[PDB]
Amino acid sequence: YKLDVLSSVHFVPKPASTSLEIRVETPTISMEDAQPLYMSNASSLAPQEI
């Protein structure tokens, strides 16, 4: 972090790496921020994934 800030963020990106992420089925509204509106009401997992 310090070296990046010092170099004004002109660094060279770190080598690409792969990781595994777990996605839990949930209503799409829950993922959004908290206010009196929602963007999408679909589910977070596609029919193939179910």
């Binding site: 209503p27 509204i29 829950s30 959004e32 908290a34 009196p36 509106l37 929602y38 009401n41």
Partner: protein, 873 residues
């Protein structure tokens, strides 16, 4: 005389009208009170910064001003007002028709002298009262006693004596007893000024023939006599800084300084103020300081300072001459032209008959400055031709300003009286520019205009030729020759494509500035006197000779509106920033506001003095006008900026004697429902449907990720124990028997009463009204709380209520939402007992209505299919 759109705000550019100013001290600091027509202003002596102005204008012009600590006394007609911080605290009304002339305040006694040689004395009701209010007595000086009163003075260390100074001689009255203590010996010359000296028992008297007398009141004899032959004393003042100096101001505009100890003249300041406006009307040394404040009738207030001597010894002999320290000023004669310098209402440019161009600030007076007339050295290298004696440029008839290239090169053009060229100025430097634009046809300049880009300047000559110069290099580029008489107006649109001109021959020329072609020519009935072009709307108005304003559209070159009603020449007019109003001033002393959309006069004013100029602020908040009398600029506030104005035409006959509501206020409110057969949504936020359907999921998102920590020992009824308001469904009280599940009579909810009432009355209109008003949480709670047990009366009634609502075709989106919540909460109940006749019949009737509202789907599908096809292929 009262406008419904505009109200006076203040007067800009005025510092003093010539009435002697008053100096008051608050602690160590000093302040000066100056008179401005029917109002006064207070300046800080250290900075000459405006502090206060009188809250309201007096009925008559102020004749005298005296200030003591916080309180200021202003005399006008037969009344003396007492002001603190510019706000009137008490008004003293004298009982005689004679007007007040002079005003003196010492101790608790207020002395006012009227023009009939009557002196009124007022006294404080209480010794600790701030100002005198009670009327004590009246002393009148008769012709045998003395001449006309010249001034009222009080000498220090005199108990209850008022030193009345008359043209003939001086008189000493005892105000407490009202008796003449002493009469001075008659003086040969008329006394004009009096000033108490810093020495005891001595008052300095100035005569009409340049004599200053140090009269000793105790001894009743002359002590000294200074002679100033062929001069008239107007002011006197002593220096209190330990140097025995005396300053004598004269009506010729000169201020002489004498050294009383040495019997010598220190210096003379020549022509500090104009003789034609009264010379030096007031000159006062600041108490205990080397600073002297001077004023005159030329609308100027100056300060001079005596520097310390340059000699290490004999400093009293080697006296540095007084040095100018600071000053404030304005025009000496009424402004001839005004304009707004910037998009904001910060600065204004004003030109006057006194041959000076000023930049006045609305935001702060100290920022006001005079634009310099120092000339730039010629680029060629030849000597510029002019008289060695420097004189100001002639009066400015027209002015044009742009800000697209401010700071890059010249951005102002001005036309002068009886001059065959136009001068340029620079707003950033505040100095005359280096270019001069000539008509090149031996004619005087009558019109000046600038392009919005700031690259071109257009000059209209009295011989009918329009020359076009470049502002950066001052090189003539193009010359148009269509008019044969004087060109009284030139304008170019924002796009710099179409140019318009007007002249005294009555024709309006339309040119293509890009291609230099004549697009068309329009002839009007009468000669055209002025033009104003509105760049946003491409409309321009022409003040014709027949007392009309003709509005023309440049795009189509046709007259769109014509305005009638002025009874004399139209001096000036302007467009409102939104392009919707025209305010015009005429020589018949009326300012009329015209509404272009309807083309009628909506407002009218009657001004005491004819308004020569009218200008809107580009913001639209202020209207500036200048009048034939007065050195300032009148600023008005646009009340249309804080409330709507009716556009009903003003009464013409009524206005002469002094000398559909939605359409009137330019608004329209949409109907609740255009037609009964038409589906109409609810009048409210469109998110209400989505919130009601998805209330739970929205709320689970709302909950914090971690449970708040709470005290174990917590009141169980804390929410109810609230000292008293909350209007939630929870905070409902019953309104006034066998047990009933839904609610026992006397203990049932408001909603259940209306539902039962509607079922009997066969009308749920009352219930539907309260459903729409219910908050989303309340609505879900009521539907969930409906009775779900046999005979299922409440569910049947609720379905009947919703079915009636769908018949109305109003608020249908909500009735659909309520039905969806009914299925969500009681769908299993309906499914289990679907065969029940009561539920089935209610459901069937709902379906019959609901089946009709499918036409909305057909419309929605068609529009997308075509809209997608139209936009794509």
């Amino acid at each position: 005389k009262n406008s419904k759109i505009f109200s006076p705000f203040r007067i800009i550019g005025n510092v003093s009208n010539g009435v002697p100013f008053a100096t008051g001290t608050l602690g160590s600091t000093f302040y000066i009170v100056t008179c401005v027509g029917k109002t006064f202003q207070i300046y800080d002596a250290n900075t000459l910064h405006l502090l206060f102005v009188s809250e309201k204008e007096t009925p008559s012009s102020i004749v005298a001003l005296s200030a003591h600590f916080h309180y200021v006394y202003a005399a006008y007609e037969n009344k003396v007002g007492i002001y603190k911080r510019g706000i009137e605290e008490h008004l003293l009304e004298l009982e005689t028709d004679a007007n007040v002339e002079h005003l003196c305040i010492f101790g608790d006694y207020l002395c006012a002298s009227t023009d009939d040689n009557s002196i009124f004395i007022y006294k404080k009701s209480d010794p600790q009262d701030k100002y005198p209010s009670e009327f004590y007595t009246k002393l009148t000086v008769t012709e045998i006693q003395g001449g006309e009163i010249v001034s009222l003075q009080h000498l220090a260390t005199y108990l209850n004596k008022l030193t009345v100074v008359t043209k003939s001689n001086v008189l000493l009255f005892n105000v407490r007893t009202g008796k003449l203590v002493f009469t001075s010996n008659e003086f040969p010359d008329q006394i004009t000024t009096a000033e108490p000296a810093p020495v005891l028992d001595i008052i300095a008297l100035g005569t009409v023939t340049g004599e200053v007398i140090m009269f000793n009141m105790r001894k009743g004899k002359r002590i000294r006599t200074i002679k100033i032959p062929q001069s008239r004393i107007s002011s006197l003042s002593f220096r209190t800084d330990g140097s025995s100096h005396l300053s004598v101001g004269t009506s010729s505009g000169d201020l002489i300084f004498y050294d009383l100890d040495r019997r010598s003249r220190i210096h003379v300041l020549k022509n500090i103020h104009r003789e034609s406006y009264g010379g030096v009307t007031q000159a006062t040394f600041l108490n205990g300081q080397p600073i002297i404040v001077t004023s005159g009738g030329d609308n100027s207030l100056k300060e001079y300072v005596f520097d310390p001597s340059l000699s290490q010894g004999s400093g009293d002999v080697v006296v540095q001459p007084p040095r100018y320290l600071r000053s404030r000023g304005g025009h000496s004669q009424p402004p001839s032209y005004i304009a707004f310098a910037d998009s904001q209402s910060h600065f204004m440019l004003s030109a006057s008959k006194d041959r000076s161009l000023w930049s006045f600030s609305l935001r702060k007076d100290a920022q006001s400055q005079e634009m310099s007339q120092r000339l730039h050295k010629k680029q060629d290298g030849g000597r510029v031709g002019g008289s060695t004696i420097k004189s100001k440029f002639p009066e400015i008839v027209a002015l044009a300003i742009e800000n697209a290239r401010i700071g890059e090169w010249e951005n102002i053009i001005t036309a002068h009286k009886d001059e065959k060229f136009a001068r340029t100025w620079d707003m950033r430097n505040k100095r005359v520019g280096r270019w001069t634009f000539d008509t090149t046809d031996d004619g005087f300049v009558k019109s000046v205009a600038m392009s919005q880009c700031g690259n071109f300047g257009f000059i209209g000559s009295s011989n009918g030729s329009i020359t076009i110069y470049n502002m950066q290099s001052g090189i003539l580029r193009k010359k148009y020759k269509l008019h044969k008489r004087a060109v009284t107006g030139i304008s170019l649109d924002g796009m710099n494509r179409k140019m318009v001109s007007c002249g005294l021959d009555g024709i309006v020329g339309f040119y293509d500035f890009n291609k230099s072609t004549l697009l068309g020519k329009l002839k009007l009935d009468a000669p055209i006197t002025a033009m104003v072009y509105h760049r946003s709307s491409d409309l321009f108005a022409l003040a014709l000779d027949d007392l009309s304003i003709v509005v023309i559209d440049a795009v189509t070159q046709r007259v769109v509106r014509q305005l009638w009603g002025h009874s004399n020449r139209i001096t000036a007019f302007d467009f409102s920033p939104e392009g919707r109003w025209i305010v015009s001033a005429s020589l018949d002393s009326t300012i009329r506001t015209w509404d272009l959309p309807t083309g009628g006069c909506i407002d009218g004013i009657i001004v005491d003095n004819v308004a020569t100029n009218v200008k809107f602020s580009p913001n639209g908040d202020l209207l500036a006008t200048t009048h034939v009398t007065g050195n300032g600029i009148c600023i008005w506030t646009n009340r249309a900026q804080f409330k709507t104005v009716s556009t009903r035409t003003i009464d013409e006959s009524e206005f002469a004697r002094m000398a559909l509501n939605d359409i009137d206020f330019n608004t329209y409110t949409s109907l609740e429902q255009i037609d009964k057969e038409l589906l109409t949504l609810s009048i409210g936020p469109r998110s209400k449907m989505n919130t009601l359907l998805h209330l739970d999921v929205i709320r689970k998102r709302s909950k914090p990720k971690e449970a708040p920590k709470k005290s174990e020992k917590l009141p169980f009824f804390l929410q109810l124990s609230g000292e008293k308001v909350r209007e939630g469904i929870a905070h409902e009280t019953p309104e006034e028997n066998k047990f009933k599940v839904t609610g026992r009579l006397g203990f049932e909810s408001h909603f259940t009463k209306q539902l039962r009432e509607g079922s009997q009355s066969k009308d749920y209109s009352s219930l539907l009204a309260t459903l729409i008003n219910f908050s989303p949480a309340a609505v879900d709670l009521e539907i969930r709380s409906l009775n779900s047990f046999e005979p299922f009366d409440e569910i049947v009634w609720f379905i009947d209520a919703l079915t009636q609502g769908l018949k109305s075709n109003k608020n249908f989106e909500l009735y659909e939402t309520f039905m969806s919540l009914l299925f969500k909460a009681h769908g299993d109940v309906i499914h289990a007992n679907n065969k029940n006749q009561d539920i089935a019949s209610a459901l069937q009737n709902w379906e019959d209505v609901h089946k009709k509202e499918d036409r909305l789907d057909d419309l929605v599908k068609f529009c997308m299919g075509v809209a997608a096809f139209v936009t794509t292929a």
